[PDB]
A paper describes a structure:
Cellulose, alginate, the Pel polysaccharide, and poly-β(1,6)-N-acetylglucosamine (PNAG) are each produced by the synthase-dependent pathway. PgaA contains an N-terminal domain with 8 predicted TPR motifs and a C-terminal porin domain, while PgaB is an outer-membrane lipoprotein with an N-terminal de-acetylase (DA) domain and C-terminal glycoside hydrolase (GH) domain. Previous studies have established that PgaA and PgaB form a complex at the outer membrane and that the TPR domain of PgaA is critical for this interaction. Our results suggest a scaffolding role for the TPR domain that combines PNAG/dPNAG translocation with the modulation of its chemical structure by PgaB.
Diffraction quality crystals were obtained, and the structure was solved using selenomethionine incorporation and the single wavelength anomalous diffraction (SAD) method and refined against a 2.85 Å native dataset. The asymmetric unit contains two molecules (chains A and B), which were modeled from residues 224–359 and 220–343, respectively. There was no remaining unexplained electron density suggesting that the original construct had further fragmented and that only the C-terminal fragment containing residues 220–359 had crystallized. As there is no evidence that PgaA forms a dimer in solution, we presume this domain swap is a crystallization artifact and that only residues 220–342 represent a biologically relevant fold. The structure of PgaA 220–342 is all α-helical and contains TPR-3 and TPR-4, as well as an unusually long α/α-motif containing 46 amino acids that likely represents α/α-5 based on our bioinformatics analysis. The α/α-5 motif differs noticeably from the common TPR fold and locally increases the curvature of PgaA, thus forming a groove with conserved residues on the concave surface of the TPR-like module running parallel to the superhelical axis (groove 1). This increased curvature also results in a groove running diagonal to the superhelical axis on the convex surface with conserved residues from the α/α-5 repeat lining the groove (groove 2). Analysis of the structure revealed that residues lining groove 1 in chains A and chain B are both involved in crystal packing. Combined, these results suggest that dPNAG binds to the conserved groove on the concave TPR surface of residues 220–367 and that W314 and W318 are involved in this interaction.
Residue numbers in the entry:
A (entry chain AAA), B (entry chain AAA): 224 to 359
C (entry chain BBB), D (entry chain BBB): 220 to 343
């Protein structure tokens, strides 16, 4: 049930990115999601049993804020999510880049896109647990 | 002055890693640092003007906890530092690995050492700010 | 033991493509390293085309090739190669989609670049 | 334009060493790719030794060589190469120190491995 409430929030945020929709309509659907959010924020804040779908709406919230052209809020919500050590999925980083750009702040948008597309190669000497141990 | 107080804390934590020193002595010097910490934690908690040297003692604290063989506390302090989105320097990760290992939990120690030694290569199409913009 | 050598040859192709994206480097240097990879490709293209035992290695270089084309500013070729790889129904990894978007954009074709980036971040 | 080719040859050496550390791979595969790099090295060793214009590229392969030796389980050689590179006063990057520690450890010499790791995390 909390899953489907987060699912509904997510759907609304996605419906907000319709270019088929005008500014009036976009803004109105962004609001339906901003509101569903405000409610669930409060309902779920102090609850370890709803920790999962809390984190989801936290990110989907970046979409709604951006859709309603509240650029500085997307950044401040991002920065607030950062300081909870929560991992922003890539699509969430796409949103905050868009925002950083529209706030006349492109260098930050670039650094986000850079950190999104790299290649990583380990240099881990295959060590046994007993060999890693003999190192401490 | 806060710099030199953090400097003193750091020095104590380093003096705790002397193998030249016995268990009694090690434990005693770990305590001098655990205490200096407890004080500075409180003195500095709600202070944006001391945010820098706060973060330093936060990490140096992992050393003292580990030196006094309080393995589970090093992990719980680490995990608490994680959820503040604070960046643990490599030497701090070395400490928490040692702890994860001594808590009979080696797979986590390995994953830390792995994430410490990699190679990273960007795949960033060099895009202009005006071209990154034309993408949003 | 038999996929080891071709694996490393595809691995070296990939590395060259990635070395071409180092922004520290000028146009002449970029172009030179892009060429080393465009060439490694042209060779392996021929060596492998009709070979089921290197079908995996073939497909890798096919995508890594998008990078080299883009790095050497051959935008229109990146798109034609993309569209050709699309019609073989093989997956373009995300980094590959980012590449073809950059190309679509530099070919003065931005609405199609957005459409690519849309499909690139889809989680439903 | 003249450091470009030697740069890419050192770059390819490095990549091979790194491909050797992929833990997905068996002993036979690891050993085979370690050899491709040990060989690339032996060639460049000779080609470059007495050449001030490739002194940079020379020094790179010198460190990357620690990886290949270690990957092929030639522990005692990693240490002797380390100690030889040490006496030329050139910096071993951190990842290089991690390598020689692993070697010192596998040569049943753990107290020296700790001493290396000590110097590896020093910030005072
Ligand atoms: Cl082509
Ligand atoms: Cl040798
Ligand atoms: Mg690489
Ligand atoms: Mg690649
Ligand atoms: Mg390397």
């Amino acid at each position: 049930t909390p899953d489907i409430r987060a699912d509904i929030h997510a759907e609304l945020v996605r419906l907000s990115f319709m270019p088929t929709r005008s500014e009036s309509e976009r803004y109105a659907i962004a609001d339906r999601a901003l509101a569903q959010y405000a409610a669930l924020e409060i309902l779920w804040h102090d609850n370890p049993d709803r920790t999962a779908q809390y984190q989801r709406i936290q990110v989907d919230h970046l979409g709604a804020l951006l859709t309603r052209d509240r650029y500085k809020d997307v950044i401040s919500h991002y920065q607030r999510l950062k300081k909870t050590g929560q991992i922003i999925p890539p699509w969430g980083q796409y949103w905050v880049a868009s925002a950083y750009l529209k706030d006349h702040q492109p260098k930050k948008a670039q650094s986000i896109m850079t950190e999104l597309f790299y290649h990583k190669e380990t240099i881990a000497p295959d060590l046994s647990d007993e060999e890693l141990a003999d190192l401490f």
